[PDB]
Design an enzyme around this catalytic site. Sequence first.
Site, PDB file in Angstrom:
ATOM      1  CB  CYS A  18       4.112   9.032  -0.284  1.00 35.34           C
ATOM      2  SG  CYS A  18       3.780  10.262   1.015  1.00 35.34           S
ATOM      3  NE  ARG A  48       7.679  10.087  -2.114  1.00 35.09           N
ATOM      4  CZ  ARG A  48       8.241   9.731  -3.260  1.00 35.09           C
ATOM      5  NH1 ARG A  48       9.433   9.142  -3.240  1.00 35.09           N
ATOM      6  NH2 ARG A  48       7.612   9.959  -4.417  1.00 35.09           N
ATOM      7  CD1 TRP A  72      -0.847  16.954   6.120  1.00 30.64           C
ATOM      8  CD2 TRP A  72       0.470  16.723   7.927  1.00 30.64           C
ATOM      9  NE1 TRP A  72       0.374  17.514   5.826  1.00 30.64           N
ATOM     10  CE2 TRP A  72       1.199  17.389   6.915  1.00 30.64           C
ATOM     11  CE3 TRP A  72       1.095  16.464   9.158  1.00 30.64           C
ATOM     12  CZ2 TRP A  72       2.527  17.802   7.098  1.00 30.64           C
ATOM     13  CZ3 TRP A  72       2.409  16.878   9.343  1.00 30.64           C
ATOM     14  CH2 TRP A  72       3.111  17.538   8.317  1.00 30.64           C
ATOM     15  CD  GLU A 117      -5.080  11.422   1.248  1.00 23.16           C
ATOM     16  OE1 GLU A 117      -4.938  10.196   1.454  1.00 23.16           O
ATOM     17  OE2 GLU A 117      -4.501  12.313   1.925  1.00 23.16           O
TER      18      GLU A 117
HETATM   19  C1  HEM Z   1       2.283  14.083   6.557  1.00 27.77           C
HETATM   20  C2  HEM Z   1       1.665  14.346   5.401  1.00 27.77           C
HETATM   21  C3  HEM Z   1       1.382  13.269   4.318  1.00 27.77           C
HETATM   22  C4  HEM Z   1       0.705  13.532   3.193  1.00 27.77           C
HETATM   23  C5  HEM Z   1       0.114  14.910   2.803  1.00 27.77           C
HETATM   24  C6  HEM Z   1       0.622  12.307   2.421  1.00 27.77           C
HETATM   25  C7  HEM Z   1      -0.006  12.165   1.205  1.00 27.77           C
HETATM   26  C8  HEM Z   1      -0.302  10.961   0.603  1.00 27.77           C
HETATM   27  C9  HEM Z   1      -1.348  10.708  -0.383  1.00 27.77           C
HETATM   28  C10 HEM Z   1      -2.359  11.739  -0.943  1.00 27.77           C
HETATM   29  C11 HEM Z   1      -1.276   9.418  -0.720  1.00 27.77           C
HETATM   30  C12 HEM Z   1      -2.213   8.680  -1.690  1.00 27.77           C
HETATM   31  C13 HEM Z   1      -3.077   7.845  -0.738  1.00 27.77           C
HETATM   32  C14 HEM Z   1      -4.270   7.280  -1.458  1.00 27.77           C
HETATM   33  O1  HEM Z   1      -4.572   7.806  -2.572  1.00 27.77           O
HETATM   34  O2  HEM Z   1      -4.894   6.317  -0.914  1.00 27.77           O
HETATM   35  C15 HEM Z   1      -0.197   8.800   0.041  1.00 27.77           C
HETATM   36  C16 HEM Z   1       0.202   7.486  -0.023  1.00 27.77           C
HETATM   37  C17 HEM Z   1       1.217   6.895   0.701  1.00 27.77           C
HETATM   38  N1  HEM Z   1       1.945   7.469   1.744  1.00 27.77           N
HETATM   39 FE1  HEM Z   1       1.951   9.500   2.222  1.00 27.77          FE
HETATM   40  N2  HEM Z   1       1.284  11.300   3.114  1.00 27.77           N
HETATM   41  C18 HEM Z   1       1.762  11.853   4.295  1.00 27.77           C
HETATM   42  C19 HEM Z   1       2.460  11.139   5.260  1.00 27.77           C
HETATM   43  C20 HEM Z   1       3.020   9.883   5.111  1.00 27.77           C
HETATM   44  C21 HEM Z   1       3.843   9.182   6.083  1.00 27.77           C
HETATM   45  C22 HEM Z   1       4.186   9.756   7.484  1.00 27.77           C
HETATM   46  C23 HEM Z   1       4.198   7.992   5.542  1.00 27.77           C
HETATM   47  C24 HEM Z   1       5.075   6.853   6.140  1.00 27.77           C
HETATM   48  C25 HEM Z   1       5.751   6.934   7.295  1.00 27.77           C
HETATM   49  C26 HEM Z   1       3.605   7.909   4.208  1.00 27.77           C
HETATM   50  C27 HEM Z   1       3.739   6.861   3.307  1.00 27.77           C
HETATM   51  C28 HEM Z   1       2.889   6.571   2.263  1.00 27.77           C
HETATM   52  C29 HEM Z   1       2.807   5.317   1.530  1.00 27.77           C
HETATM   53  C30 HEM Z   1       3.630   4.018   1.693  1.00 27.77           C
HETATM   54  C31 HEM Z   1       1.708   5.555   0.486  1.00 27.77           C
HETATM   55  C32 HEM Z   1       1.179   4.546  -0.543  1.00 27.77           C
HETATM   56  C33 HEM Z   1      -0.019   3.941   0.175  1.00 27.77           C
HETATM   57  C34 HEM Z   1      -0.628   2.858  -0.663  1.00 27.77           C
HETATM   58  O3  HEM Z   1       0.073   2.386  -1.600  1.00 27.77           O
HETATM   59  O4  HEM Z   1      -1.804   2.491  -0.381  1.00 27.77           O
HETATM   60  N3  HEM Z   1       2.900   9.067   3.999  1.00 27.77           N
HETATM   61  N4  HEM Z   1       0.380   9.779   0.821  1.00 27.77           N
END
Ligand code: HEM
Lengths: 411, 407
Positions: B106, B109, B278, B283
């Site tokens: 992610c 973070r 968000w 994406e």
């Molecule tokens: C608030 C702004 C956030 C942004 C800008 C963001 C950004 C991203 C991006 C770009 C990815 C790659 C997703 C993909 O390529 O399919 C990702 C994956 C991920 N995010 Fe974040 N995220 C946010 C919030 C969160 C929150 C609130 C959580 C958990 C409470 C989280 C947990 C994760 C996890 C576990 C992954 C890996 C997902 C997977 O393996 O399919 N994210 N995030």
Amino acid sequence: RFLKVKNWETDVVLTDTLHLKSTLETGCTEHICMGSIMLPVRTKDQLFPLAKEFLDQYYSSIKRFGSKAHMDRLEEVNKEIESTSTYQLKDTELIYGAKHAWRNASRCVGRIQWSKLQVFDARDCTTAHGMFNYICNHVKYATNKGNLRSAITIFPQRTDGKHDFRVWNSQLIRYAGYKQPDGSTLGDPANVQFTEICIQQGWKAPRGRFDVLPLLLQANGNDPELFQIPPELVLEVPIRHPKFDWFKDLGLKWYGLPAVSNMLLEIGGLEFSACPFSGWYMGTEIGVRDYCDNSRYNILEEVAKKMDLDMRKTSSLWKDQALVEINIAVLYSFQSDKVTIVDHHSATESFIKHMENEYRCRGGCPADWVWIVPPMSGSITPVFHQEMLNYRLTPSFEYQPDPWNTHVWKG
Amino acid sequence: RFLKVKNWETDVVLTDTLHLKSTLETGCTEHICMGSIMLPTKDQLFPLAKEFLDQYYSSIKRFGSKAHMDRLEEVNKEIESTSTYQLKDTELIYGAKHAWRNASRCVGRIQWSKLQVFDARDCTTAHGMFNYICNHVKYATNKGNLRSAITIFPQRTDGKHDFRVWNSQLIRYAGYKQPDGSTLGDPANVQFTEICIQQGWKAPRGRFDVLPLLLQANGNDPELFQIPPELVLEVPIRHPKFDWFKDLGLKWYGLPAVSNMLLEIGGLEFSACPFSGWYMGTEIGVRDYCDNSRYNILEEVAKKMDLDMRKTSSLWKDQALVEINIAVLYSFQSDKVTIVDHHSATESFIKHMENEYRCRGGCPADWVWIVPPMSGSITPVFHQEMLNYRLTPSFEYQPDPWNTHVW
Ligand code: HEM
Ligand code: HEM
Ligand SMILES: CNCCCc1cncc(CCc2cc(C)cc(N)n2)c1
Ligand SMILES: C[C@H](O)[C@H](O)[C@H]1CNc2nc(N)[nH]c(=O)c2N1
Ligand SMILES: C[C@H](O)[C@H](O)[C@H]1CNc2nc(N)[nH]c(=O)c2N1
Ligand SMILES: [Zn+2]
């Protein structure tokens, strides 16, 4: 053991068995992946198994495994190792070895070409002047007036580690970098340290933005010597853009021949510390990295200005937009001048086919995803969606310390 | 054993000590790196509880306190008696926030400590689940000013009473195989859509049909619910320069909400824990719109721009890609829906890494996922060495329920 990799775009699943032949370390553990880490005197004891492993591969490849020729050769190498503490490769083995080092190079997207490599045997070389001559001939042959030909020139192997042949240049052709008293940089910022060494060794720097560096050549563990590559041998391409006429006025050019000279070639436990090799460029190496890295020529700003993009918010993607035009221009320029170059779409598509071919015929193809995926437009190339296994096979190309950090000066 | 990471753009070197607390395996070995692979009892339970409670009590500067020991004592008794244990609200919130903090894939973070946690452990039916999810969606969306949130449903007991959201994300578009042999809507969602239809969904067979929720409570058979349309915020996609772009009929949803993952805290397993933040522009614009196995619109856009699509070397694909991504960002910003571009997001992540190294001794990061799917090397993360390792609490992948469910 069987390992499957999947292409998430096509659902094609391949099975790797080749990794069973993997020898060296990866840097990773069951507890940590070091997949994005850039960089993670041999006894007769360790030497004979390495020689034997290599000779078994060589004889298998020529379908003479277990032949008398195979067995006599093992015998000959064994005796030579116990007598002289090392051994000499036959020409055929040297060529086989060099081709396979390239074949095994997990960071190279160009490997579809691996079987076409001109190998220049320079093991009879004894002096820096001799090295200079060999490298000039390599450059002229490889350049071929723009119809580029892959080549490698192989200088004598390491003995006691006190008589190493080394090319001190990281690449045969590169532009000088000069740090200014005001902190600014003229030329290629990547090469400031090496340029300083060259200057200290007596090089007379023109101090321009695109000065081809002299060769700094070390033979037989002696102090290195400066040589200027004849300018007529250095093919360069003025960069222009097909639609933007102001692009030429940026004053950009690049050299046509990409030629790595700081790596170590290992074949059958033998170490070739000077083995410059060259192919042809993929456009992004120049247009993305050389031109647009903040730590290099860094021209994104100037280009974006001239395109009059909105540069107040990153969200206009002005950087992305300029980046594309620059890479269009690099490709356009090389093509227009009939200098071999390949775009990242063509190169990655060819690699996927090569890789699949390798799985079928070889049982695998080690690949470093982090290096294979182009530095722009990653996911619209097919390598992005391709799972890859990274492991290390011999023969291989390896990193080695920079000579200026290890060299014992004779004076 | 004390590992160094280098940024090759800035020469900054960071020392990682946090990885010596990792426990789960990576997939890699000393002989083979699998960094690009997408998916690589009272006895078991108590050390996990302990390790978690130790880090919890350390976090509140009460390590080795009597309250620390008391809690440890209490949890141990509960495991011995009841075979499992119940997290205190404080622990649950801590764990959820840390799962996100530990998510090595992610890029977002830097926001990890600002997470709204909805305790849905009192839920008992799929209707209950539906209500909780609607409220999450409404809260997170916040009329376009998005707020990070997670809703946590009851933990696994005997594995035969799992709560599951069957949808991979709370909000996604349907996929239909046509007689034309082609594909209508989102090709990634064809199988799930089939299951929805088979379960009784009345599909409108359109190109952007918001899928119904398929909700499983207490290990029972999953039930169907339509999210109130008025709570699903969507953005029509237009370009600031190209007037014709609107005619492509493109839109996307404002809320990225992952619903198929498993939240592990202190050895406890939350199989149903949808979370949302968000979007980063790429994406949608790069993956959702330009992946060949997704909406795959590169060719059409290129043609409307009248690019030379004869030769790959004109880079028409790259040009169209940039404009598609320009349009995505412009459309969200125009409609005032929170979005972040890849430059801004990767920049934030670098500062976060530096914070995490400085105050935690490290930050687990998967470079393969962190680097954006376009313009990789003009973002700082490309030049940033990263160490990838598994810390708990964590979000984990889990099997799709339809391969698991005894009907
Ligand atoms: C608030 C702004 C956030 C942004 C800008 C963001 C950004 C991203 C991006 C770009 C990815 C790659 C997703 C993909 O390529 O399919 C990702 C994956 C991920 N995010 Fe974040 N995220 C946010 C919030 C969160 C929150 C609130 C959580 C958990 C409470 C989280 C947990 C994760 C996890 C576990 C992954 C890996 C997902 C997977 O393996 O399919 N994210 N995030
Ligand atoms: C003929 C066309 C070739 C193409 C298009 C090509 C492409 C590339 C590219 C784009 C890289 C990454 C360079 C960088 O990011 O700095 C690379 C790396 C590499 N290539 Fe190839 N290459 C070619 C020929 C060769 C040849 C002839 C050899 C050796 C005989 C070779 C061996 C390697 C090795 C060892 C690396 C890793 C370099 C490093 O770690 O710095 N390549 N190649
Ligand atoms: C290793 N990171 C720094 C590389 C800098 C650098 C400077 N000049 C030339 C190259 C050439 C890389 C390269 C080598 C070969 C053989 C083919 C090809 N297409 N590209 C690399
Ligand atoms: C830190 C990271 O490994 C580094 O920036 C790598 C990423 N991938 C690369 N890929 C290529 N082809 N060349 C490079 O120099 C790099 N650099
Ligand atoms: C094979 C490879 O691991 C796969 O295509 C990955 C690459 N990087 C990714 N990065 C992100 N953020 N999301 C993804 O889905 C993927 N897919
Ligand atoms: Zn690894």
